Amino acid sequence: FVRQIQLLLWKNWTLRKRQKIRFVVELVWPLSLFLVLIWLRNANPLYSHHECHFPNKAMPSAGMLPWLQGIFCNVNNPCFQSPTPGESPGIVSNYNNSILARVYRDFQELLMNAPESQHLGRIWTELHILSQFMDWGGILSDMSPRIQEFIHRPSMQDLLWVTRPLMQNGGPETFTKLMGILSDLLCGYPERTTSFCNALIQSLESNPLTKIAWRAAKPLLMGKILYTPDSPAARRILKNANSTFEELEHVRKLVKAWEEVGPQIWYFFDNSTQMNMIIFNITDRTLRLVNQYLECLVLDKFESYNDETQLTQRALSLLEENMFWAGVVFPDMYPWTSSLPPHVKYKIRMDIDVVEKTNKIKDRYWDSGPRADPVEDFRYIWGGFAYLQDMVEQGITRSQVQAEAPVGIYLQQMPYPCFVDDSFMIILNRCFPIFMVLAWIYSVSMTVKSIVLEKELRLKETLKNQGVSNAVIWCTWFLDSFSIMSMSIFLLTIFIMHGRILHYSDPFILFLFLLAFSTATIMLCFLLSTFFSKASLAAACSGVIYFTLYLPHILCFAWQDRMTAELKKAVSLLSPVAFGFGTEYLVRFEEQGLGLQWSNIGNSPTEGDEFSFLLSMQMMLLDAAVYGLLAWYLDQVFPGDYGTPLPWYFLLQESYWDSFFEREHPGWVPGVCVKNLVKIFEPCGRPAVDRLNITFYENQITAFLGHNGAGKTTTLSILTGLLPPTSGTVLVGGRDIETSLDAVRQSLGMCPQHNILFHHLTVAEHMLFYAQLKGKSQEEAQLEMEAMLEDTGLHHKRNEEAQDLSGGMQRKLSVAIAFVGDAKVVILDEPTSGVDPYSRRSIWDLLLKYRSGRTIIMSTHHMDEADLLGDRIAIIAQGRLYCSGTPLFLKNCFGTGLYLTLVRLDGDVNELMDVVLHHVPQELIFLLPNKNFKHRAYASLFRELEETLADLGLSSFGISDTPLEEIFLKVTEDSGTQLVLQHVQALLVKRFQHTIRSHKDFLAQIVLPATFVFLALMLSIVIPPFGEYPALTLHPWIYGQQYTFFSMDEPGSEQFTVLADVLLNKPGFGNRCLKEGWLPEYPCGNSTPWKTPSAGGLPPPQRTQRSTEILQDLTDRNISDFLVKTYPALIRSSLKSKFWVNEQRYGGISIGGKLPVVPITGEALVGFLSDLGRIMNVSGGPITREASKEIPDFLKHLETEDNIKVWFNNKGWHALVSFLNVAHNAILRASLPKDRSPEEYGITVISQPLNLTKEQLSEITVLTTSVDAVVAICVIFSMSFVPASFVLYLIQERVNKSKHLQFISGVSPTTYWVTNFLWDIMNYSVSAGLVVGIFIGFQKKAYTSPENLPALVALLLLYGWAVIPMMYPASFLFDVPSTAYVALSCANLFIGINSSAITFILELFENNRTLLRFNAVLRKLLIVFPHFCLGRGLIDLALSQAVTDVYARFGENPFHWDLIGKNLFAMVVEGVVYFLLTLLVQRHFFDDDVAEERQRIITGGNKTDILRLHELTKIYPGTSSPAVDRLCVGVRPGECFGLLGVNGAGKTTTFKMLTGDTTVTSGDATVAGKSILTNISEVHQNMGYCPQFDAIDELLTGREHLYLYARLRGVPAEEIEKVANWSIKSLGLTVYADCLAGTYSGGNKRKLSTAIALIGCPPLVLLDEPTTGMDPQARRMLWNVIVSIIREGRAVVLTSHSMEECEALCTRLAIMVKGAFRCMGTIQHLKSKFGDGYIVTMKINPVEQFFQGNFPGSVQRERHYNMLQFQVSSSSLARIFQLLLSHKDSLLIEEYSVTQTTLDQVFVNFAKQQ
């Protein structure tokens, strides 16, 4: 048993080591995919970040001016490495770095600080009062140095310098660098309307640079606010909320006041009182234009409503022009209500595009990064959410309390420390499963192909019957595949950790995962090999099934919410799905920085995944187990269409796992018996055999005979178990077949009609392999093999492989294989076919040696051989037995008579018969009676014929005693432009007829990829339906167990004592434990006292409040340092049992802070204005009077002091709003009257967006790009696996030599190639139509646009045009028509993916430096491959469609040269040049009797000779021995020549050289004066070829072949039918004329071959053994047609191995030994020259004594078991015949024959010289 495994692994290694040009690429193919992801590793360094702090965002409650300067200042939210001054505990200004604040400080220091300034102001006021009453300069002079120092201040100096380009000439660069100047002067950082308004709007939207900013700013400026609960309380809230709007209205009315003044200033300047002392023009235009601009702005934004639906329908219309800011809805405070509830809540309806998604609170997968992109991360602030919430909350607070509580609000993000920030993980998470699953599509396909092919060409079944069970071969295949794949993964093992792909994970567990996946893959291979039984089909539908098995992995990527751990496991029964889940968990562990190192196994990577890597491993191993069980079941239930009979599925329910026939003589133990057996083929309808009843015995060498196609191979293969019998007894001696299958398959040799052998194996190894399956060790086989080598004669080719041997050598090797070992039941079939008699007699001697205890059923067609060996002959005619018994009984019961075998331009055939009848009343045979002999008249006639040998011209004769050939013959009786058009139409109809009869191989290699992409598209259609975003309540305890804190800064103020004490204790921290009904799920809790457990300095204290909070005590320290250092420690500590890395920091409120406020004190400026008005007397204006009234309120709302800073983290998507609301509630509760309990008064906010069927334009767009990207390589796979199916027919035509036989006809290579190309492009154009039909049916909007549909159709058609002439050269390289398909499909798919995905990664979703240019370089370089032109074009079309629909959503050419124009108009040239390359590679880079013959051939020669040879030679490379050498024979027309010789001499070699297959090494072959080295198109016009190996399409009938070659020979289309009928009636091919070529017997096949050779009537016919494997009575018809052609005068050359056929036809002879001729004369010349005397044979010791006593001159030649042969000359044959007939009973002679130097004897005498 283990010895069998050792032998099988030995032979597998032996065959593999001969192919170390394909094993290596099989081993290293998966590693070839990982070349892009080493360059991505090297080109994506981990760009580490630096810790940077955030600016303090302002808020409208902090003051209108601070809010505006903030929104203009921190537009980009630039984080700063150093901490900001506003992050200190007490500073909330953070703006003195600006030059405006600096010059204001300089003004406040130089003036209004020294007492001199106050004295000057008082003196000026007194002087003004005195002048007013009337209607010193020393202090003014003393003020001159002060102002001189003021104007010379460096702050003012740089201010004056930078204000030089202050909008000179209307603006130096408009809105290009003026923003920079404004930032310098206000944002000092260390890095229905007027037609004028409409015109400005249209001008600004015209500019695309300013159009993007004018998308959200317009709702912010001229938007509208809708409030549905129009309550009086709501209205007073809004009156307390529009305070900043009122301030803006006042400041807008201020600029309108320059109309009451107008020219009053100019009146003073021109004609006032005391104008004589004794600009305005340049500034007034600016004032008026900014007045107009402020007039254009809309300031009334609140609009009432009553219904939510009305609010939504108005908001939609407003946002159509971007005029809807936000919608505020209060669930409480109904319009009929007018009071303030103690607890008030509102829900802010908003657009989805300007709010974050409510269904999710954070990123699903944690990563590094502060999440601080100003345009998308901070969607609340620039979207107008935080401002609106602040305004409404300030309104409600001022409406509730009456202390007005002036406290500003600022926000400040917690800074992030330095991290890695690698971009490789983003592409890794989306591409790694693909590259890890596509690396396993080539090896599985190759293994499936190898197994199915081995099952196909008769390799598993030929050894299964010998000694091997299916378990043995199955486990050897399993172990071999496991070893190879283990080597593959071991090469893959140390490739990524040393490739720097991973750095933390242990590279040992993934090795186990890879071996589990290897087991899964080999089990899949076993299953798939059991599924198929055809080479082409299995090669085709191999990777498609695997890839569509990987397909549903994308579904879980789409459905990230539906999938659970149980749901993951449920569909994890597929190996690729479990593999992909393992891959994604590995990248999840790697992205966290921990990786899988013997610790993360059994642990979920992200929150409640509840799925383990060990769980995936368990799923994979159980998948392998169930797959193996199913494979075993299917193998033992469905072996396939051909092979062992199929057991039924009930094998597991059982507990156990008339007078012409001779009677049986005694001593005949029945070994094999088959009675009443009938076999029927379903398509034919006529049974092959009907009523077989045989009695084979234990040791008799019984010969099986019958005409070709009767029952022979069927009957001799039905008892070896490889063909299912259709009822019939098969009992072989108590061990019945189909029951004792194992017992009968122990001692049984077998050789089929054809040859079965291992291609990559030598003779010696082939013998040793089968010399050890019977328990024999190495020693027995080694001692045994040499005897077989020396007996079979195959000792000169011991180590000469197996594929260089001809048919006879293969037959000899097969019979030697069946001979070795002990096999009682050998079933040798047809050992004598195309073999020389010299080896045939050796075969006979070997067979009679092994007949003592063996049953032999040897079958043949040489009746002489059967008579010599077979002691019992059974003949089967038309599938039924006709006669049986010993040959003596057969000739007794079927006539016993003598035959005259005289041979015969000389010949009369008119008087020889007359004189013969007078005595006894070129193959003339005369029947003579064996008995009633006169014994003297016969001798008299013999003497007369001897005397009349030459004059009659017969020249030869012989006498035989009843040969079996006559018995067989007796019993077989009763049983031009039009020419090219014709060529192309004939080839087209031939290909069409071939294809229509291959249905299962048409709709499986063509439309299967269409079904694949259809399934992929349908799966991509299935998507999670849109759901409206829920009403998200906003309270910080959503996360639970948070890490808050506070600062208690600036405790001096009594209000600051009031606050930061009611916040900490009573209502928890926000609204939890609020003494009423709110969020009942969260418990109130109990307080925990202070704690100071034992980064920076010391750990500050903390306290656990009643709510789930651990607020800290960072009150007196630097908050920034501790808050930025605790978070790394926090996330490090969070790794304990929480591998999802959840954080606890979520906010923080730092009380205290102050800013410098201008101490105008209100009425001081009003007094200044009144003074200037009463002095200048230019005042007076209703606008002036109404605007000079609210100055104290204007200044009060302008600024606010004593503010708070609200810290926040940014990972949470709602931290800002939640903690801002918490701080606002704390402020409101703090400043409250000391009358009510400050616990039952709070505010809760909800940020539910509008209930609109619209999603965020940042994931659906990415979702659409992904869904067009997941269906972007499926189409590549489909259109990469289609063109490979067109090379199978080409390579199978090349291998079986059918294409060359077509080239023998008058067909130019170009016409054949263009017909093939036209058929391919017509055939290809059923895939493009199908895929575009699927596209239009699914309405793929990326391509179903009418503008792009013709573009897509043209792209597909051109891709098909330029893809066909690329696989044409492959047919000239491969040899097996299933490895070429796999290799080509894999290579095409690999280049397609590695051309498309690289550009997709490099250009989209990535902006590279110094390699982005390389992307353009390769795009200009990679266009040569049509696959790149297809994939890149398709993805670019999809991307362009995405961009167009994005711009259409914002509000808004396929034939382009750079889009598809360069793709299309530079691919047709590629197609035509590749076709020209195909044509180029098609045309290029592809002793005595003979002494007089050679001299006459050279130096002139006969002018009428047809194919005069000249010194033909040939030596195969690597052999150092010429196959043929120096051949020169001239043939006259009308002469039938004979090329006889030993097997392997080179007859086939010479024919294939002279027919144009093999190039001539040296010499010339002058065919009618035309050299073969010259053009052979005209040489092909006068030839007909019948090769030794059949070359025909098995899916056609003979009549189709005849029509095809009649069209190809130039025959007009009206005589085709009549000449076809003439040919079929002259060759007898009429019963099977209209039958398929696949179901043809060997004799039938050769008959068809010679029939197709003779068509067209050329003056030359070439035959390469037309009679090998041909039954008698079929030779005679060939002889008749050949002699008809000869008497027609056209020369014919014939070769054979039967001696009778040549002497019947062939005139001249040429014995070829080792490629060297030995004779040239005709039959009688050789018989007279070579050999002497007469040859007499006898068939039964005393006979030898009689012969030596009567005949002095004789030789005991050919001494065998039961026959004798001699060369007695004597004087005349009459005396020898007389003495033989005298001693008939004395010698016990059974069979005798007398002749004179037969050609077989001289043949074996020539053959024995070696």
Ligand SMILES: *[C@@H]1O[C@H](CO)[C@@H](O[C@@H]2O[C@H](CO)[C@@H](O[C@@H]3O[C@H](CO)[C@@H](O)[C@H](O)[C@@H]3O)[C@H](O)[C@H]2NC(C)=O)[C@H](O)[C@H]1NC(C)=O
């Ligand atoms: C509160 O803690 C922060 C540390 O996070 C202290 O801020 C640090 O202050 C120094 C002052 O020199 C900053 O230095 C910077 O140097 C560059 C280069 O000369 C200069 O251009 C900057 O203007 C600045 O002076 C430093 O960046 C900053 N932060 C760091 C990283 O230490 C702050 O002083 C602490 N407050 C206390 C305890 O007073």
Ligand SMILES: *[C@@H]1O[C@H](CO)[C@@H](O[C@@H]2O[C@H](CO)[C@@H](O[C@@H]3O[C@H](CO)[C@@H](O)[C@H](O)[C@@H]3O)[C@H](O)[C@H]2NC(C)=O)[C@H](O)[C@H]1NC(C)=O
């Ligand atoms: C909150 O304050 C803003 C800013 O002051 C208010 O907007 C302005 O309010 C006034 C007073 O209602 C509006 O004036 C009215 O204009 C119409 C149109 O000519 C006129 O017929 C009335 O006699 C009155 O003068 C003004 O249009 C409006 N906005 C502008 C463009 O200045 C706002 O109304 C206040 N919101 C609340 C909560 O009521």
Ligand SMILES: Nc1ncnc2c1ncn2[C@@H]1O[C@H](COP(=O)(O)OP(=O)(O)NP(=O)(O)O)[C@@H](O)[C@H]1O
């Ligand atoms: N798969 C098949 N379907 C239909 N007919 C078949 C099939 N295989 C063989 N046959 C025919 O069944 C008959 C079998 O007769 P048989 O004498 O066994 O032929 P053979 O031995 O295979 N060739 P030969 O030695 O020349 O007679 C022939 O007519 C075959 O052509």
Ligand SMILES: Nc1ncnc2c1ncn2[C@@H]1O[C@H](COP(=O)(O)OP(=O)(O)NP(=O)(O)O)[C@@H](O)[C@H]1O
């Ligand atoms: N590709 C090959 N390389 C090397 N030797 C080969 C090759 N093909 C065949 N041979 C051998 O070289 C000789 C070629 O002569 P071949 O034409 O086979 O002889 P043959 O007498 O015509 N044989 P056959 O027609 O089958 O009876 C034989 O000995 C072949 O076995």
Ligand SMILES: *[C@@H]1O[C@H](CO)[C@@H](O)[C@H](O)[C@H]1NC(C)=O
């Ligand atoms: C002015 O800005 C600098 C910048 O760091 C700061 O240190 C300083 O405290 C500021 N002074 C005032 C008065 O705001």
Ligand SMILES: [Mg+2]
């Ligand atoms: Mg046969």
Ligand SMILES: [Mg+2]
């Ligand atoms: Mg040959």
